[PDB]
Design a protein around this ligand. Structure first.
Ligand SMILES: O=C(c1ccc2nc(-c3cnccc3C3CCCC3)oc2c1)N1CC2(CC(n3cnc(C4CC4)n3)C2)C1
Length: 289
């Protein structure tokens, strides 16, 4: 029988088979009553859906049915770790899961929540289905990568794109730039389901594709969104958040800047994280009443 990369049979776990025949591990948090809306949680590179337990439980407490899967190559889903044939695979698979849930739960509004790479996936998902999503919550979405990281990575990308170098990777990122909360950093460094290895160059190329595709999608984006961004973000440059606010056509767009905060706002210092949870709670509550 088919098993996760951690040797657990998929028959023992919630799952979905994607269009490429790959098993995706799924998570669900459903309220005891009739849901007011559905919301898909889109995780970022290297991590997995289990990192969203507390946010998901908050949203479920608002009577939303929260659902997620581990993207291909991540967590408990299948696929060579941190490989993707094309970035759109992630978007396609989100859409499959959304479409499946909308059948089981017809007539409900559907929201997207995405962090980091998962925020770029959310943007591209909404841009593919204009008018279909009720709203998007973006936590430091990948709109522009760190300019310094992008420049040096593009040099590595040149080698892989001009030669046959299938194993080339970037150096690992220093986990301390992910959050000022050292306990959250230590937890991230301890989770066996998180891939903390240096980025394979082929995957980083797909992140460059994500950035290019987000740029082209902005003038089409009309979905309501809440955008949360730290001013000291070394992964997704804050300039991308300002550009998203300026270039999206959405009539309902709000930006909250957390001064001094690092990339992972929902795992930051308690004052930041508590505010992040409260702001998402209010924004979703106002749009599901
Ligand atoms: O999605 C991403 C992402 C986004 C942009 C990236 N950029 C590179 C990158 C790296 N090295 C060389 C180059 C690059 C880029 C330069 C140009 C293109 C590639 O890696 C990225 C990853 N995540 C980080 C990520 C935050 C997750 N988290 C969950 N908890 C925690 C801790 C606080 C508790 N952290 C892990 C989710």
């Amino acid at each position: 029988p088919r098993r996760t990369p951690q040797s657990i049979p998929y028959q023992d776990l919630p799952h979905l088979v994607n269009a490429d025949g790959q098993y995706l591990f799924c998570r669900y948090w459903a309220p005891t009553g009739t849901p007011k809306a559905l919301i898909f949680v889109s995780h970022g590179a290297g991590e997995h859906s289990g990192r969203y337990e507390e946010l998901a439980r908050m949203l479920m407490g608002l009577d939303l049915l929260v659902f997620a899967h581990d993207h291909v190559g991540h967590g408990q889903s299948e696929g060579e770790r941190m490989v993707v044939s094309d970035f759109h695979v992630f978007v396609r698979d989100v859409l499959q899961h959304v479409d499946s849930m909308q059948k089981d739960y017809p007539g409900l509004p559907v929201f997207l929540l995405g962090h980091s790479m998962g925020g770029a996936i959310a943007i591209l998902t909404a841009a593919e289905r204009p008018g279909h999503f009720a709203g998007m919550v973006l936590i430091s979405p990948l709109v522009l990568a760190n300019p310094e990281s992008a420049t040096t990575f593009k040099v590595l990308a040149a080698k892989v794109l001009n030669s046959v170098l299938p194993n080339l990777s970037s150096g690992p990122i220093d986990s301390s730039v992910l959050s000022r909360n050292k306990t959250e950093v230590d937890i991230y460094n301890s989770d066996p389901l998180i891939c903390r290895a240096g980025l394979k160059v082929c995957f980083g190329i797909q992140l460059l594709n994500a950035v290019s595709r987000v740029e082209r999608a902005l003038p089409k984006l009309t979905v309501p969104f809440l955008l949360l961004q730290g001013s000291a973000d070394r992964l997704c440059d804050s300039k991308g958040a300002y550009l998203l606010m300026e270039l999206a056509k959405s009539q309902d767009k709000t930006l909250k800047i957390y001064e001094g905060a690092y990339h992972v706002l929902h795992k930051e210092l308690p004052e930041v994280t508590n505010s992040v949870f409260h702001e998402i709670n209010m924004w979703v509550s106002q749009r599901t009443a």
